[PDB]
DNA sequence: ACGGCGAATACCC
DNA sequence: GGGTATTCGCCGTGTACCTCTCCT
RNA sequence: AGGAGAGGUA
């Protein structure tokens, strides 16, 4: 609860349950891309908060783009 | 066979099952009756065999239904197949709604008052077990061990490169903490762990009334969510920062409680003729700098200049300006108020009720994190200014009124006259009951009244100033603060304990005319043990009554879920005020808040105010009371 | 993986007799106080 | 409660259990039909539609 | 007030006004005076027959079947135990003595019943009958090397009890309760028809039983209403045997009526002493209730009139001429102690013995039949051993400190065989009755489901000869209180008016008042003083022994005294003991009336002293003809039942003059013969920074370094050498493939060295057993050819230390193979042990007669055959007896567990300091967990620089009305000041005429007790004054304690304000607090709830077998139970993914656990949750009934 | 919290 | 031990 | 024949945790 | 490995 607020994301998503579903899809796609093991052990963040933050900034993803069918 | 197992024992034995006993007791009658049938043995014994084969199977399926107690070696009835699926210790309960789990631990909880509301203190020794495969992977990742055996090895020697990997692994990885009876859903909350040293768990002081915990011995369990869908579910739904209000009411659960309430109550009181009275400050930095110098009191009335924005009910934002009349202590709290809230919230004495109101407004007008920041800051300020106050309790705080002895002597003379009546047979049940008990019940409260006119008032007469001022007594300020203590509890320390109860409920005619300060005698301390034992006996022979009711309620209503936005219905119930037949006892407002309308709410003249289908909120229930509507 | 036990005499299932009501004393319409005599060898019934 | 009085009747009537419930879904270990267990069904109904 | 040896090294100032009338009786005399009646005879207390012999005497003549054989009990004697109480727990034996009885036979010429046993074969002898465990000198039992206590029992006293059960009207019952037998009870109904019943049979009419005389015409003669008339015209039976067969139809379902089996039953359900008894109390209570004494005082069976009278009184009570009984009165409940219970089990086993003798008295056919091959003794030993090993009232002893033991030996349970259940009972057997006053403590009980059902004993209370508790009072004859103590029972004092100890008397022992609060029917009252009959002897007469250790108890709340008493039975004893500065005058009694302090038996003077023994030189002119020398041996670092440490330390110096009773050593948590469970701390009542927020406690770290709450903890591990089938288990050090570095701390045998520091995970003993048939998988076959691994015909069952633990080995004990020639190692160790131990017995014996001869050559040098020519031949037998037994074992001092060869024990001891997480408490009901140890320059401090020890929140005090906690801190400030008034004088002119003058103002200025220091010499004033430098100790009794005028006077003399309040300074800035704080000297304890043995995390361990879930309990590797209420909460959040894995992949999805672990360690994501393996278990045992539960696909 |  | 519920059977409308 | 009026059996009675010995 | 009895904590 340092610098990612759940109130910041409840302006984009619904129900506080949709937030969990969408954030988990985003996080799973981040983690199934590498994101570690090579050079950034203590130089990055957790995919959970990285995915939860891109929703609170209208960043790399919005709810409609989060699919990647 | 692997479900009725034959595990060995210590020293050449077998702790066999009861399902093998009851299987053998059936095979050994089946075979017997078979080779008895082969020989054409008489019917008068073949029937006796057949009746024995049947009872053996009835016991294999469940003993106790018809037979008596078909019993094993240790004079204890054998456990059948219809006992491994039924009752509190069967399969359904104890194994399928149950499930002991891995990645789990326990410890004792301590207080740790320098935490933020979203944090807990987790020992290194526990956190190293709970997070052990994560550590194996992060070792074998960042080039410390090649195969998992050397990593497993350096984890048990507790190297130096391990205690920082553990700090990076548990960084933004939450954990849930639970207490002994989980009575509602606030008994589990997720936190963010920070490695401490020691063997207890540190628990933020404000999440304690949720858990119902204090720090005289309680313990707690720690579970680790393992998957990203459970790690996100921990942050988004359970994390302690989201659980600000009760789900049974709307009231807040992070309201400061005991000695945060006393500090905030202390500094915001005011003393009339104080040192530095009437000064003129222009900021919070001003009052701070002038206070830190020892030249001005904390209860001195001052004048302060404010200039701040204040949101109101409709949502508009006016501007609060001017020069207000304050106290030094209130103006020292002006630093923690956020923008949106008016200084009229702090500009009062700050009993428990008013602090909860501050937190209510902060949540309704400003939202979630504003409230969890304001609460932390109120926590720190109360903790600090109750200390700097040096507030204690002695034995002279319990001030015993000066009329007590005369009050009691007059009650005694009245009792003597009542029995004087009774000795001439002028009354039978009253002249030894319901009259003496009313004398004593009236004197009890006259003396409890005299005792608050002595612990509440004070006296100064300095500049011809001889008058009564509100006291700063430490026992009084603890009750009037709403921090801890009642009027009856205070009535027994320094008034008189009055009438006691034999367990059946009747009143013991002879009242304890002494309080805990002068000390009870032995014939007075005896008669107060009946009530004490009765209470303690009720307390434990009652949680079963309530736990049963709760379990029934959760089984009747369990599968009810909100599954759609509207059903289109137009029927409902007629709500009113729930009067007693004498007075209101609850308004229609506070009963219709949050409930949506099924019919229009046309007024007595003819025009309507609210259409059907409007979610009533606080900005629409004043129209119900301002326009005289009552159903 | 289970096995079985080839009984040589039939035996009633206690549940279908003493679960109150009895799904056996109700099929025949005879009180369980009378089914329990025939089942534990203390009286006769005329099958035909 | 009353597990035998319930199981005998259920077996005579040859009852069928559509799982369908909160408690029925924890005994067999799958997502309860509430909360995030509903929303994953809902938010996944949107994908097969978008792939069509 | 010096007046003793240790009672004058540090004198305690006493407060209070009430006199001394009766001193607290010996505390344990409920356990020791009841196993004395069982085994010994006393003609002074009129016990001419021990109760071991009243059981034999009443059952023995067997007379098998007209065979010229009749056995007669003659006499008995109890043997001598093999070992002593000290050696049994060492080896693992039970401290018991054999019983041998004298039995004589008789015979004659087997004639036509012409005295077939009168003539010949008059043989007689002593025969072994069984083993009886003996009670040690304190009141415990060593049963397989384990101290135990046999709790007392409160049960329902025999007699006739007329209940009512008020639901309808006219319903009246009447039960006759036996000591042992059948429950004959009657009843009524609003219809008016008397019924009957036997043990639990169905209700059959009352005139049925009346047929013992029948005679329907001779009933109404001795029986005047329509009640039996509604029964006499309800009795269809006319003849006797018809009614008997009717009643027989109730005593046997499915039976046919006989003619000699039916009459035997009725004539032998209430009339055969071998199957029914009222037992001396039923008879007298019956004769009292029914009033008459038509029956004798020794007829323990139901005479015929004891049923006619019961029927008559039932109808009279129904008609209003009488009163019903009170089931919870302590007149209707009697106490049954350990002697009575073991006597019952003795009677049980002896009946089987005497029923087997006469049986095999015939089937034995030989010549010269001695009475030794006909009686067996196994069914006596085996019943007594069953009572002691598996009984429910025979419990592990509570040690943890002296008070735990003293308070466990004084406990009176209502549960147990013959009593209630923790569930059936409710709400009125759990209630403080009016007859508990003086008899049971109405404050001390458990706080769980046992509340009201455990009920320890009061202070002056006495179980009398019938089993009814009693309490002492002072007769008030002719209006003047006299000094004749008298013990009254609950039935007795029902008709007396009883004042209290603290009523006001005036110089002539008259009452000064005219209306006082008395107890007139057990009930309180405000009556004239002319009506009083008795008066209590003390003011702690009402409270227990552990509640009388709490100062200022009349200023506390019973709900909190209840838990203040219960928590000082959990206090760990400390490294160095320390008195309470505020006490009650009862720590001496509790430490003395337990057996932890050493007490001198004779007047003497110390001859030698060290920390192993004390040798007194008996002054024989004032003492008995004693041995001329007393030798006391000392306990040193002994393990306790709670793994704590018991240790004795001597007090005396070589040359000291001691008396009879004086304390010569201190023991388990004692300090100059006073009980010391914790330390005195300087407490400040103020909030500090949220570090005492709820009930937390803040400590000084001047306390951890001062080693205040440090304690020693001894743990005992065992390793056994079995005789397994596939190969014997040997304890040789040749551990296969063990690292050679770990082979250092072990001796040439394979056991550790005494004194090594072992860590978690080291070998303590090395035992090896065989193992063959390896057959490793192909993985090891593809990589084992690179090192050419060797084959192991042996395994390693070698004991290791557990996890987390450490310490140093302080003792190792070995017991080798029973009845087997040991090799050049084990037999050598045993021979050296014998040579060393007999040598120590020699030096112990070479000094006893050394002092004896030093005394013999004392009164003769300055006929010598009187007292010199006897001592030397006496001690030789002592070294003789001790010398063989010290090696006279069974090669393991026991059977060594057949199938096991050697058993070795290892003791490890560790020191434990207080830390954040540990639980602390004071004697006033206030507990709390330590949150922080602050540095010392951060604590508040006094004006002169003295820091503070603890800070305790003041909010908790007025809500929980325990004010004695505040008065204690005031009286502790007072005493701290009084004791610095002495340290000031000691550093300036340390004479003994000055010290004798400051002590006079410290002691004899406040109060009327007057220590009287004019009886100490100047060498004693100098040690008294040097012990009063921490504080002058003060004693305040429990309802007669110090006032507030007195605490104010003492605070003045100490130089403080007449409130406990003073200015403190912020240790972090140095400026004062406003508002003076209350500082004082509260006495604080440390309870056995340390956080070290409570932490327990687990990631993945090992699982069950049937359900395949994790194990549970921190002893295997635990795993916490995510219960069902904890699942309702995850459901109320909507956490579906959290709830699906806490049910499948975390506990018992067998295929999912391995994949989750392999995923985490590799950093991947995948999750299939197939189905929890405990649902397959349930559907597999629902089809083990006849039912088919199955999965399906629903196409329709 | 409620029984009487 | 207590309570509440339900099938069983005997005693009057 | 119908309708109560006892009578008797069955099912239920809070959560988590620690220790000991004893049996198998 | 499992169960009984007994105690205790919240
Ligand atoms: Mg607590």
Swiss-Prot record, chain A:
InterPro entries: DNA-dir_RNA_pol_omega (IPR003716), Pol_omega/Rpo6/RPB6 (IPR006110), RPB6/omega-like_sf (IPR036161). Transmembrane segments: none annotated. The keyword Hydrolase does not apply. It holds the Pfam family RNA_pol_Rpb6. One of its GO terms (molecular function) is DNA binding. One of its GO terms (biological process) is DNA-templated transcription. PANTHER family: DNA-DIRECTED RNA POLYMERASE SUBUNIT OMEGA. One of its GO terms (cellular component) is DNA-directed RNA polymerase complex. The keyword Transmembrane helix does not apply. Promotes RNA polymerase assembly. Latches the N- and C-terminal regions of the beta' subunit thereby facilitating its interaction with the beta and alpha subunits. Keywords: DNA-directed RNA polymerase, Nucleotidyltransferase, Transcription, Transferase. It comes from Francisella tularensis subsp. holarctica (strain LVS). This is DNA-directed RNA polymerase subunit omega. It catalyses: RNA(n) + a ribonucleoside 5'-triphosphate = RNA(n+1) + diphosphate. Belongs to the RNA polymerase subunit omega family. Its EC number is 2.7.7.6. It is an enzyme of class 2 (transferase). The RNAP catalytic core consists of 2 alpha, 1 beta, 1 beta' and 1 omega subunit. When a sigma factor is associated with the core the holoenzyme is formed, which can initiate transcription. It comes from the Bacteria. Gene3D superfamilies: 3.90.940.10.
From Swiss-Prot, chain E:
Keywords: DNA-directed RNA polymerase, Nucleotidyltransferase, Transcription, Transferase. The keyword Transferase applies. One of its GO terms (biological process) is DNA-templated transcription. InterPro entries: DNA-dir_RNA_pol_bsu_ext_1_sf, DNA-dir_RNA_pol_bsu_external_1, DNA-dir_RNA_pol_su2, DNA-dir_RNAP_su2_dom, DNA-dir_RNAP_su2_hyb_sf, RNA_pol_bsu_bac, RNA_pol_bsu_CS, RNA_pol_bsu_protrusion. GO terms for molecular function: DNA binding; DNA-directed RNA polymerase activity; ribonucleoside binding. GO terms for cellular component: DNA-directed RNA polymerase complex. It catalyses: RNA(n) + a ribonucleoside 5'-triphosphate = RNA(n+1) + diphosphate. Its EC number is 2.7.7.6. It holds the Pfam family RNA_pol_Rpb2_6. It is an enzyme of class 2 (transferase). The RNAP catalytic core consists of 2 alpha, 1 beta, 1 beta' and 1 omega subunit. When a sigma factor is associated with the core the holoenzyme is formed, which can initiate transcription. DNA-dependent RNA polymerase catalyzes the transcription of DNA into RNA using the four ribonucleoside triphosphates as substrates. PANTHER family: DNA-DIRECTED RNA POLYMERASE I SUBUNIT 2. NCBIfam families: PRK00405.1, rpoB. Belongs to the RNA polymerase beta chain family. This is DNA-directed RNA polymerase subunit beta. The gene is rpoB.
């Amino acid at each position: 609860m340092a610098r990612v607020t759940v109130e910041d994301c409840l302006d984009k998503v619904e129900t506080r349950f949709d937030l969990v579903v969408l954030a988990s899809m985003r996080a799973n796609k981040i983690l199934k891309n590498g994101y570690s093991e090579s050079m950034e052990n203590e130089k990055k963040e957790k995919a959970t908060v990285v995915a939860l933050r891109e929703i609170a900034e209208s960043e790399i993803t919005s709810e409609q783009i989060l699919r990647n069918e | 066979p692997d479900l009725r197992p034959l595990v060995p024992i210590e020293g050449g034995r077998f702790a066999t099952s009861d399902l093998n006993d009851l299987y053998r007791r059936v095979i050994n009658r089946n075979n017997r009756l078979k080779k008895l049938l082969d020989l054409n043995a008489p019917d008068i014994i073949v029937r006796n065999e057949k009746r024995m084969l049947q009872e053996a199977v009835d016991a294999l399926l469940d003993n106790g239904r018809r037979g008596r107690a078909v019993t094993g070696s240790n004079k204890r009835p054998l456990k059948s197949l219809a006992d491994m699926i039924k009752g509190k210790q069967g399969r359904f309960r104890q194994n399928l709604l149950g499930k002991r789990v891995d990645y789990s631990g326990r410890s004792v909880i301590t207080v740790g008052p320098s935490l933020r509301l979203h944090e807990c203190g987790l020992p290194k020794k526990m956190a190293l077990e709970l997070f052990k495969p994560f550590v194996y992977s992060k070792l074998r990742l960042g080039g410390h061990a090649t195969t998992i055996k050397q990593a497993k090895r350096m984890v048990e020697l507790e190297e130096a490169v391990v205690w920082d990997i553990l700090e990076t692994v548990i960084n933004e990885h939450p954990v849930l903490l639970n207490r002994a009876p989980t009575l509602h859903r606030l008994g589990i909350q997720a936190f963010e762990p920070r490695l401490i040293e020691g063997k207890a768990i540190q628990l933020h002081p404000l999440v304690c009334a949720a858990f119902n915990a204090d720090f005289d011995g309680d313990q707690m369990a720690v579970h680790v969510p393992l998957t990203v869908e459970s790690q996100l579910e921990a942050r988004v739904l359970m994390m302690s920062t989201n659980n600000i209000l009760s789900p049974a009411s709307g009231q807040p659960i992070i309201t400061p409680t005991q000695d945060i309430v006393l500090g905030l109550y202390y500094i915001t009181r005011e003393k009339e003729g104080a040192r530095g009275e009437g000064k003129l400050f222009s900021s919070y930095e001003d009052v701070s700098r002038a206070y830190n110098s020892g030249t001005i009191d904390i209860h001195a009335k001052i004048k302060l200049r404010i200039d701040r924005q204040v949101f109101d009910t409709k949502g508009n934002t006016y501007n609060e300006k001017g020069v207000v009349n304050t106290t030094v202590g209130r103006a020292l709290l002006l630093n923690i108020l956020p923008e949106g809230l008016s200084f009229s919230l702090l500009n009062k004495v700050l009993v428990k009720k008013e602090i909860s109101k501050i937190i209510n407004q902060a949540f309704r007008v400003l939202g979630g994190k504003a409230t969890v920041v304001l609460a932390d800051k109120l926590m720190y300020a109360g903790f600090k200014y109750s200390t700097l106050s040096g507030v204690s309790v002695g034995v002279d705080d319990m001030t015993i009124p000066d009329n007590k002895e005369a009050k009691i002597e007059e009650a005694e003379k009245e009792i003597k006259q009542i029995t004087e009546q009774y000795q001439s047979s002028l009354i039978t049940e009253n002249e030894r009951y319901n009259n003496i008990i009313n004398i004593w019940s009236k004197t009890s409260d006259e003396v409890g009244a005299s005792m608050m006119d002595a612990i509440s008032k004070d006296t100064v007469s300095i500049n011809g100033e001889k008058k009564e001022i509100e006291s700063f007594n430490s026992v009084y300020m603890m009750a009037k603060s709403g921090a801890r203590g009642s009027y009856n509890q205070m009535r027994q320390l320094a008034g008189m304990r009055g009438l006691m109860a034999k367990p059946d409920g009747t009143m013991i005619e002879t009242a304890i005319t002494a309080n805990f300060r002068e000390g009870l005698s032995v014939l007075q301390y005896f008669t107060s043990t009946h009530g004490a034992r009765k209470g303690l006996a009720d307390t434990a022979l009652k949680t079963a009554n309530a736990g049963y009711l709760t379990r029934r309620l959760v089984d009747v209503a369990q599968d009810l879920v909100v599954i759609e936005e509207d059903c289109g219905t137009d029927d409902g119930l007629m709500f009113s005020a729930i009067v007693e037949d004498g007075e209101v006892k609850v308004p229609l407002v506070e009963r219709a808040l949050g409930r949506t309308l099924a019919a229009d709410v046309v007024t007595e003249k003819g025009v309507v105010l609210l259409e059907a289908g409007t979610l009533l909120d606080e900005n629409l229930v004043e129209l119900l009371d301002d326009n005289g509507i009552d159903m | 993986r289970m096995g079985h036990i080839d009984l040589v005499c039939p035996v009633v299932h206690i549940w279908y007799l003493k679960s109150l009501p009895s799904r056996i004393g109700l099929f025949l319409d005879m009180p369980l106080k009378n089914v329990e005599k025939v089942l534990y060898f203390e009286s006769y019934i005329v099958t035909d | 409660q009353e597990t035998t009085r319930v199981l005998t009747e259920a077996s005579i009537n040859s009852q069928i259990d559509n799982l369908r419930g909160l408690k029925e879904n924890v005994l067999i270990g799958r997502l309860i039909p509430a909360g995030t267990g509903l929303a994953v069904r809902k938010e996944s109904a949107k994908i097969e539609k978008m792939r069509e | 007030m010096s007046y003793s040896y240790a009672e004058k090294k540090r004198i305690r100032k006493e407060f209070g006004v009430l006199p001394h009338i009766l001193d607290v009786p010996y505390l344990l005399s409920i356990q020791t005076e009841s196993y004395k009646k069982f085994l010994t005879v006393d003609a002074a207390k009129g016990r001419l027959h021990s109760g071991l012999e009243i059981v034999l005497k009443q059952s023995f003549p067997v007379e098998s079947k007209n065979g010229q054989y009749e056995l007669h009990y003659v006499d008995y004697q109890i043997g001598e135990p093999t070992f002593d109480e000290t050696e049994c727990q060492v080896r693992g034996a039970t401290y018991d003595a054999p019983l041998n009885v004298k039995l004589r036979l008789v015979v004659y010429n087997k004639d036509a019943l012409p005295n077939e046993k009168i003539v010949e074969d008059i043989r007689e002898e002593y025969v072994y009958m069984g083993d009886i465990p003996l009670m040690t000198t304190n009141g415990t039992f060593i049963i397989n090397g384990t101290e135990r206590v046999v709790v007392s029992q409160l049960h329902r006293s025999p007699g006739a009890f007329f209940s009512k059960d008020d639901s309808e009207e006219g319903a009246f019952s009447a039960r006759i309760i036996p000591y042992r037998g059948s429950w004959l009870d009657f009843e009524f109904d609003s219809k008016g028809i008397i019924w009957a019943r036997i043990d639990r049979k169905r209700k059959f009419c009352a005139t049925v039983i009346l047929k013992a005389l029948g005679y329907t015409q001779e009933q109404i003669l001795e029986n005047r209403g329509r009640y039996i008339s509604d029964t006499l015209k309800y009795d269809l039976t006319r003849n006797t045997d018809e009614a008997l067969v009717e009643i027989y139809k109730v005593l046997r379902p499915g039976d046919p009526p006989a003619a000699a089996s039916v009459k035997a039953l009725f004539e032998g359900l209430f009339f055969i002493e071998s199957r029914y008894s009222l037992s001396d109390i039923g008879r007298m209570k019956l004769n009292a209730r029914l009033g008459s004494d038509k029956v004798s005082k020794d007829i323990y069976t139901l005479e015929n009139s004891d049923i006619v009278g019961v029927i008559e009184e039932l109808i009279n009570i129904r008609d209003g001429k009488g009163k019903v009984d009170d089931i919870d009165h302590l007149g209707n409940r009697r106490v049954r102690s350990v002697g009575e219970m073991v006597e019952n089990q003795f009677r049980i086993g002896l009946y089987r013995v005497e029923k087997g003798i006469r049986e095999s008295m015939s089937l034995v056919h030989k010549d010269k039949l001695m009475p030794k091959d006909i009686v067996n003794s196994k069914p006596i030993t085996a019943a007594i051993k069953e009572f002691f090993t598996s009984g429910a009232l025979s419990q592990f002893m509570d040690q943890d400190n002296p008070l735990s033991e003293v308070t466990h030996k004084r406990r009176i349970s209502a549960l147990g065989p013959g009593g209630l259940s923790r569930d059936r009972a409710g709400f009125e057997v759990r209630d403080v009755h009016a007859t508990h006053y003086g008899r049971l403590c109405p404050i001390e009980t458990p706080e769980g489901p046992n509340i009201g059902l455990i009920n320890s004993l009061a202070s002056y209370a006495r179980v009398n000869d019938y089993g009814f508790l009693e309490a002492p009072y002072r007769k008030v004859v002719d209006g003047k209180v006299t000094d004749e103590i008298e013990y009254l029972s609950a039935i007795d004092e029902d008709n007396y008016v009883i004042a209290q100890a603290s009523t006001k008397l005036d110089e002539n022992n008259h009452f000064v008042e005219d209306i006082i609060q008395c107890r007139s029917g057990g009930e309180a009252i405000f009556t004239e003083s002319s009506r009083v009959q008795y008066m209590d002897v003390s003011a702690k007469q009402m409270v227990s022994a552990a509640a009388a250790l709490i100062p200022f108890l009349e200023h506390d709340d019973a709900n909190r005294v209840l838990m203040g008493a219960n928590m000082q039975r959990q206090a760990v004893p400390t490294l160095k003991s320390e008195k309470p500065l505020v006490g009650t005058g009862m720590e001496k009694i509790v430490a003395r009336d337990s057996g932890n302090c050493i007490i001198a038996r004779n007047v003497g003077e110390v001859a030698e002293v060290d920390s192993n023994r004390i040798v007194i030189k008996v002054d024989t002119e004032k003492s008995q003809t004693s041995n001329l020398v007393d030798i006391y041996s000392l306990t040193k670092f002994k393990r306790s039942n709670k793994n704590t440490c018991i240790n004795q330390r001597p007090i005396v110096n070589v040359g000291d003059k001691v008396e009879a009773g004086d304390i010569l050593a201190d023991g388990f948590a004692t300090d100059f013969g006073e009980l010391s469970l914790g330390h005195n701390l300087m407490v400040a009542f103020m909030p500090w920074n949220g570090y005492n927020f709820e009930d937390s406690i803040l400590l000084s770290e001047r306390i951890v370094k001062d080693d205040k709450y440090t304690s020693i903890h001894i743990e005992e591990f065992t390793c056994v050498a079995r005789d397994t089938k596939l190969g014997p288990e040997e304890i040789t050090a040749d551990i296969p493939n063990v690292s050679e570095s770990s082979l250092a701390k072990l001796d040439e045998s394979g056991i550790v060295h005494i004194g090594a520091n072992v860590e978690a995970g080291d070998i303590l003993v090395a035992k090896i057993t065989p193992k063959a048939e390896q057959q490793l998988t192909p993985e090891e076959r593809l990589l084992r050819a690179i090192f050419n691994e060797k084959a192991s015909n042996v395994v390693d069952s070698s004991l290791r230390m557990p996890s987390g633990t450490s310490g140093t080995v302080i003792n190792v004990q070995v017991f080798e193979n029973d009845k087997g020639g040991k090799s050049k190692r084990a037999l050598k160790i045993e021979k050296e042990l014998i040579d060393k131990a007999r040598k120590d017995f020699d030096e112990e014996f070479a000094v006893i007669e050394s002092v004896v001869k030093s005394s013999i050559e004392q009164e003769v040098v300055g006929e010598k055959v009187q007292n010199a020519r006897e001592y030397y031949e006496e001690a030789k037998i002592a070294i003789d007896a001790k010398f063989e037994a010290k090696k006279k074992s069974i090669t393991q001092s026991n059977e060594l567990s057949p199938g096991v060869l050697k058993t070795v024990k290892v003791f490890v001891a560790i020191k434990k300091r207080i830390q954040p997480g540990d639980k602390m408490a004071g004697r006033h009901g206030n507990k709390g967990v330590v949150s922080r140890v602050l540095p010392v320059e951060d604590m508040p401090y006094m004006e002169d620089g003295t820091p503070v020890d603890v800070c305790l929140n003041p909010l908790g005090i007025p809500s929980r009305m325990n004010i004695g906690q505040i008065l204690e801190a005031h009286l502790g400030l007072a005493s701290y000041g009084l004791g610095k008034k002495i340290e000031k004088t000691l550093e300036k002119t340390r004479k003994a005429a000055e010290l004798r003058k400051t002590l006079e103002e410290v002691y004899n200025s406040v109060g009327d007790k007057k220590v009287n220091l004019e009886a100490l010499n100047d060498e004693e004033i100098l040690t008294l004054c040097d012990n009063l430098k921490g504080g002058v100790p003060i004693a305040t009794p429990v309802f007669d304690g110090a006032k507030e005028e007195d605490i104010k006077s003492l605070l003045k003399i100490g130089g403080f304000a007449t409130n406990g309040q003073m200015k403190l300074f912020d240790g972090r800035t140095g400026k004062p607090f406003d508002r003076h704080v209350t500082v004082g000297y509260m006495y604080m304890l440390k309870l056995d709830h340390l956080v070290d043995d409570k932490m327990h995390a687990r990631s993945t361990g090992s699982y069950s077998l049937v359900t395949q879930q994790p194990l549970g309990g921190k002893a295997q590797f635990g795993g916490q139970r995510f219960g069902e209420m904890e699942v309702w909460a995850l459901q109320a959040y909507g956490a579906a993914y959290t709830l699906r894995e806490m049910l499948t992949v975390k506990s018992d999805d067998i295929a999912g656990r391995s994949k989750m672990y392999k995923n985490i360690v590799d950093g991947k994501l995948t999750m299939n949750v197939d189905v929890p393996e405990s649902f397959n278990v349930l559907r597999n045992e629902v089809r083990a009934l006849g039912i088919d539960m199955d999965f399906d696909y629903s196409s329709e | 919290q409620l029984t009487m």
